[PDB]
Ligand binder design. Structure first.
Ligand SMILES: *[C@@H]1O[C@H](CO)[C@@H](O)[C@H](O)[C@H]1NC(C)=O
Ligand SMILES: *[C@@H]1O[C@H](CO)[C@@H](O)[C@H](O)[C@H]1NC(C)=O
Ligand SMILES: *[C@@H]1O[C@H](CO)[C@@H](O)[C@H](O)[C@H]1NC(C)=O
Ligand SMILES: *[C@@H]1O[C@H](CO)[C@@H](O)[C@H](O)[C@H]1NC(C)=O
Lengths: 212, 185, 189, 16
């Protein structure tokens, strides 16, 4: 009960793993294992009238079987399947994937069936002075996404080489904000931010700051 | 956006040449199914379906002429490109039966290997981890739009409870030869 | 080991209609990279990459080669379409084999997933539908992609989550043009 | 009389 919840940043591949604990097993007994994964896009709000469906299933032979329109995002790594791991791997984070996911892993001896929830959190960095900055004026950047829990650590960096920016007399940091009072022309370039969490959710979102 | 749709599409001959080693190949495919191919050294046209050869005939000398001109094309290109690199990709296999599996009735197990690049691959079969080679068919290398290739192998076998079959793939772009196991029911 | 290289040449005939509109495209590939391309809509060999600039120019300075390639639209594409291809592809007939399977059974009153295997058919426009007691179901339906067997035949597997009581009978319904009336396979619980 | 008509594929050649 109390199904766990996992967040996902839109446009970024999300890790959805589920392995059988960690005992080293015989690979011959590992190749003989089927997998079924179902999804029910739902929410607390009345998104349904108040439905589940099978997205993909692979028998030990290696054949795919899912919804009539093929899902190009989901592509099992196959390597991890031969390494005692069953993980969902989508390349683009689907904003329509917000819902509940259930599993079914069938082996000749034992069997596990993991289950959890997925919530799509669109990550973006919003600027208080929307536009191109003047030769010298203030600026504020807030990078975040739709998540109730507050980040534990926030990192900033400047330039295409991603040089981590620290708190300076001209670089003010407070919670998840960055401010520069005087924006010299040297401050132009790609400024990015990296977020953290208790579950270890990284969000590396960039923004091209242009100064006069 | 890159794909254009037509009622029917035919390659009417695909030429593949690999250097060094002088690996030549010339096929004839229409709408997915291989109509036939042309043998390299035997100088003969081999049809995938025997009934297809009862109504049409292709001259294999034109097959040898085109594989020779493709050899010349690759030769002058490798001489002009000087130092240019070539990449390798690891293929992906999938084992499935041809007809619905009925225990005790002879069936054909198919091993489909996609994303083959370069097209140099050893596709073998193992019966209960033992080497087996009883009626092992191998089609020619079909071509994908990714410029990779996909081949299919056939094994006529008898499904039994005491037999487990696996398809072994050995490729240049594979650090180890991978084996896909399979056991019905 | 040392330097390996792969070359490829092909020429595709696109038939949007029967004999009305034909399209011809020749492609040259070096190391999974196309460098020379000819199109019937263009009328001459164009260099898709700069590497194929001189080669295509050699095919643009020869009038007999260009006229031969332009005539290949009728001598290679249309001639093969109206002759051999019409007599070897349209004449090849097929019949789908439709069977029914079940992963798990037990009392069957619990949750279950019924399987319909349509094998050994030439690929065409097929409409496969699940019917419970005569009514079509769409929820819980999961069908595999078009599986190319490579031997001119195809194969597909459809699945329906069948929960209702044993007293009801299920049926698989497929609509393939090679068969006049859609064959219907029934399974009792 | 019925014949096995089948037009061949025609490649091309560059100089380089
Ligand atoms: C600023 O970001 C925080 C977390 O980084 C977020 O909770 C908040 O909604 C954002 N916007 C504000 C405070 O206007
Ligand atoms: C965030 O950090 C963890 C711990 O190093 C790492 O495994 C993970 O890949 C990072 N997340 C993303 C989305 O890159
Ligand atoms: C394939 O088998 C041949 C012998 O039949 C061997 O020489 C070759 O190294 C094998 N593997 C590859 C990747 O060529
Ligand atoms: C295809 O060709 C036939 C025969 O000439 C013609 O009747 C038909 O209109 C054509 N199709 C289209 C879409 O124009």
């Amino acid at each position: 009960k109390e199904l766990p919840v996992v967040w996902a940043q839109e446009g970024a591949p999300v890790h959805l793993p589920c392995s059988l604990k960690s005992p080293n097993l015989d690979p011959n007994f590992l190749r003989r294992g089927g997998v079924i994964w179902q999804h029910q896009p739902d929410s607390g709000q009345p998104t349904p009238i108040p439905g589940r469906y099978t997205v993909l299933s692979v028998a030990p032979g290696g054949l795919r079987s899912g919804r009539q329109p093929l899902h190009p995002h989901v592509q099992l790594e196959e390597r991890g399947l031969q390494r005692g791991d069953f993980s969902l791997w989508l390349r683009p984070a689907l904003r329509t994937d917000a819902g509940e996911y259930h599993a079914t892993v069938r082996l000749p001896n034992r069997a596990l069936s993991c289950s959890l929830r997925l919530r799509v959190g669109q990550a973006s960095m919003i600027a208080s002075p929307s536009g191109v900055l003047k030769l010298s004026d203030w600026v504020l950047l807030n990078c975040s996404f739709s998540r109730p829990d507050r980040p534990v650590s926030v990192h900033w960096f400047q330039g295409q080489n991603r040089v981590p920016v620290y708190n300076s007399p001209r670089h003010f940091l407070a919670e998840t904000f960055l401010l520069l009072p005087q924006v010299s022309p040297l401050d132009s370039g790609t400024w990015g931010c990296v977020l953290t969490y208790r579950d270890g959710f990284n969000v590396s979102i960039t923004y091209n700051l242009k100064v006069l | 956006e890159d794909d254009i749709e037509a009622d029917h599409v035919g390659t009417y001959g695909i030429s593949v040449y690999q250097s060094p080693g002088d690996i030549g190949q010339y096929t004839f495919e229409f709408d997915g199914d291989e109509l036939f191919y042309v043998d390299l050294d035997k100088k003969e046209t081999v049809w995938m379906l025997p009934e297809f050869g009862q109504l049409a005939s292709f001259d294999p000398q034109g097959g040898l002429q085109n594989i020779a001109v493709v050899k010349h094309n690759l030769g002058v290109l490798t001489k002009r490109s000087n130092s240019t690199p070539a990449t390798n990709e690891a293929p992906q296999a999938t084992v499935f039966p041809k007809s619905p599996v009925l225990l005790g009735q002879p069936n054909t197990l198919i091993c489909f290997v996609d994303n083959i690049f370069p097209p140099v691959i050893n596709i073998t079969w193992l019966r209960n981890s033992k080497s087996v080679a009883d009626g092992v068919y191998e089609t020619s290398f079909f071509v994908n739009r990714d410029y990779s290739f996909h081949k299919l192998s056939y094994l006529t076998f008898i499904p039994s409870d005491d037999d487990i079959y696996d398809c072994k793939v050995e490729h240049w772009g594979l650090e180890e030869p991978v084996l896909k196991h399979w056991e019905p029911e | 080991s040392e330097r390996h290289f792969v070359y490829q040449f092909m020429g595709e005939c696109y038939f949007t209609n029967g004999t009305q509109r034909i399209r011809y495209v020749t492609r040259y590939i070096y190391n999974r990279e196309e460098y020379v391309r000819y199109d019937s809509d263009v009328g001459e060999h164009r260099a898709v990459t700069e590497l194929g600039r001189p080669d295509a120019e050699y095919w643009n300075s020869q009038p007999e080669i260009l006229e031969r390639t332009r005539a290949e639209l009728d001598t290679v594409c249309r001639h093969n379409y109206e002759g051999p291809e019409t007599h070897t592809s349209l004449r090849r007939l097929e019949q789908p084999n439709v069977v029914i399977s079940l992963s798990r059974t037990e009392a069957l009153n619990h949750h279950n997933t019924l399987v319909c295997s349509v094998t050994d058919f030439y690929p065409a426009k097929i409409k496969v539908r699940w019917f419970r007691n005569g009514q079509e179901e769409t929820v819980g339906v999961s069908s595999t992609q078009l599986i190319r067997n490579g031997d001119w035949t195809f194969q597909v597997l459809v699945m329906l989550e069948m929960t209702p009581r044993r007293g009801e009978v299920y049926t698989c319904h497929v609509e393939h043009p090679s068969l006049k009336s859609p064959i219907t396979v029934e399974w009792r619980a | 009389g019925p014949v096995s008509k089948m037009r061949m594929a025609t490649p091309l050649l560059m100089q380089a």
